[PDB]
């Protein structure tokens, strides 16, 4: 995603991305992205750690999940809004056209 997407079509790191083995390549992308919409996706995605903490109806540790996700959904709405402003330059035409 990172490479064949975002970064270049978004014009940012035209240095495509060089990863050896840090701690979460998908993430780090955050610290250096100038477009909030894009930027929230990142922290939320690199988190949403499957909030592994529950003890219901009497002893049922069933690693739960965000109300957010649940049906607050917005995540989606935001996942979209961020997408809604990824439409720009760098390489051949048949590219952006097709992608966007």
């Amino acid at each position: 995603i990172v490479n064949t997407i975002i970064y270049p079509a978004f014009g940012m790191q035209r240095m495509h991305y060089r990863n050896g083995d840090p701690q979460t390549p998908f993430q780090i992308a955050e610290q250096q992205i100038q477009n909030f919409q894009v930027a929230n996706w990142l922290h939320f995605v690199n988190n949403n750690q499957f909030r592994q903490v529950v003890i219901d109806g009497v002893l049922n540790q069933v690693l739960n999940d965000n109300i957010r996700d649940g049906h607050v959904i917005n995540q989606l709405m935001e996942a979209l809004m961020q997408l809604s402003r990824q439409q720009f330059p760098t390489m051949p035409v048949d590219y952006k056209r097709s992608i966007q």
């Binding site: 978004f10 014009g11 940012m12 790191q13 955050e30 610290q31 250096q32 992205i33 100038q34 477009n35 909030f36 930027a39 402003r85 439409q87 720009f88 330059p89």
Partner: protein, 397 residues
């Protein structure tokens, strides 16, 4: 160094051209330059301070860049940007200040601080840009070994000097002849006095002369020359040359006779003006020589005759004078003047942070002391330090 410069014009032309609304295509050329920076930086660590009462703040870099899309700018865009700028501002301030205090006998013209020494590094050169700020402009032209030059309104070329020279005196100090003056900043006032009103002088004329040697050559000077020295036109009780007693000066003013001002360069007369008061131009000089005379009035009404008897006591002391002010001039060396805040900025930062006296500059950056012994080392350090002050004032005033 030049590096440093950019960092600012970057931010200024930034905190200036990036506002809610403007059209992108006005900053396209700019935006770029900016990012380019962030890159070169990220992955670097710095440290400033450590001297006197100057805090030691540490810095790291790790930033995202900026969108390129958007016909126009939305408020949100700015705020996410301004937040990044503010870290650089608060940075540079600390960078400037840290290199604005250290002095070095040896290479007082080179970078000092751990902060800057690291910048002159090659890997950072990829950031230079738009050097049009008068000071940096001259910083370059010099580094290449060429002809510099600056502009000053009421330059500060004369170290403070207020004194007198008695050419004829006696214990009672009742029949003196000599000159007294005040050289300070861009002004000179000098008076020649003769208690005897040239009664026994050849042609009843007493000659006077005042020579002032500049520590640096001034070129293209616009100067006001006026007859009379108001500062020495009133009654005074003055200490004797040896400090053992006090004498009385009771002036009465006459027009200076045969006034001749010479602006010399290395002993050669470059400009000479005979009795010309008002505005005159001195195009290149390192010395000013003012010659003027007191001529006993050949014809005197009774009231005048009464002031000048043939014999002592001499109670009214004939005095002639001149006033010369350098309104503007150009100097190849940095100087303090009446408009620029450089000296005040450097002096102020050092005072605020209790910076200890160093090996180059006089205590308190005292101007008179500095210009009196304006050594090459003091000038190189002063220029470095003035250029940094000017870089700082583009963002922080």
């Amino acid at each position: 160094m030049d590096v440093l410069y950019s960092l600012s014009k970057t931010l200024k032309d930034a905190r200036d051209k990036i506002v809610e609304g403007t059209l992108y295509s006005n900053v396209s050329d700019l935006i770029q330059q900016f990012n380019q920076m962030i890159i070169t930086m990220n992955g670097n660590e710095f440290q400033t301070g450590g001297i006197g009462n100057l805090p030691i703040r540490n810095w790291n870099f790790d930033f995202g860049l900026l969108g390129t899309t958007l016909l126009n700018l939305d408020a949100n865009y700015v705020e996410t940007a301004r937040n990044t700028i503010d870290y650089f501002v608060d940075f540079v301030d600390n960078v400037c200040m840290d290199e604005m205090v250290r002095e070095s006998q040896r290479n007082g013209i080179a970078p000092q601080s751990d902060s800057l020494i690291k910048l002159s590094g090659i890997k950072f050169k990829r950031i230079n840009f738009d050097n049009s700020s008068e000071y940096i402009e001259n910083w370059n032209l010099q580094n290449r070994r060429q002809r510099t030059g600056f502009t000053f309104h009421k330059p500060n070329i004369f170290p403070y000097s207020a004194s007198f020279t008695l050419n004829r005196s006696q214990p009672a100090h009742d029949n003196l002849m000599g000159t007294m003056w005040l050289n300070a900043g861009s002004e000179i006032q000098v008076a020649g006095f003769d208690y005897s009103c040239a009664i026994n002088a050849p042609a009843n004329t007493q000659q006077f002369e005042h020579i002032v040697q500049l520590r640096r050559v001034l070129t293209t000077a616009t100067i006001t020359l006026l007859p009379d020295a108001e500062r020495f036109s009133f009654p005074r009780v003055i200490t004797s040359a040896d400090g053992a007693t006090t004498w009385y000066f009771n002036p009465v003013i006459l027009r200076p006779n045969n006034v001749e001002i010479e602006f010399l360069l290395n002993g050669q007369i470059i400009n000479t003006y005979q009795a010309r008061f008002g505005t005159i131009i001195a195009r290149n000089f390192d010395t000013i020589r003012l010659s003027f005379q007191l001529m006993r009035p050949p014809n005197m009404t009774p009231a005048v005759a009464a002031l000048f008897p043939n014999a002592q006591p001499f109670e009214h002391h004939a005095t002639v004078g001149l006033t010369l002010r350098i309104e503007s001039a150009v100097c190849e060396s940095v100087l303090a003047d009446a408009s620029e805040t450089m000296l005040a900025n450097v002096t102020s930062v050092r005072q605020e942070y209790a910076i200890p006296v160093g090996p180059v500059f006089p205590p308190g950056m005292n101007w008179t002391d500095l210009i009196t012994n304006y050594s090459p080392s003091r000038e190189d350090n002063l220029q470095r330090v003035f250029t940094v002050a000017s870089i700082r004032s583009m963002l922080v005033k």
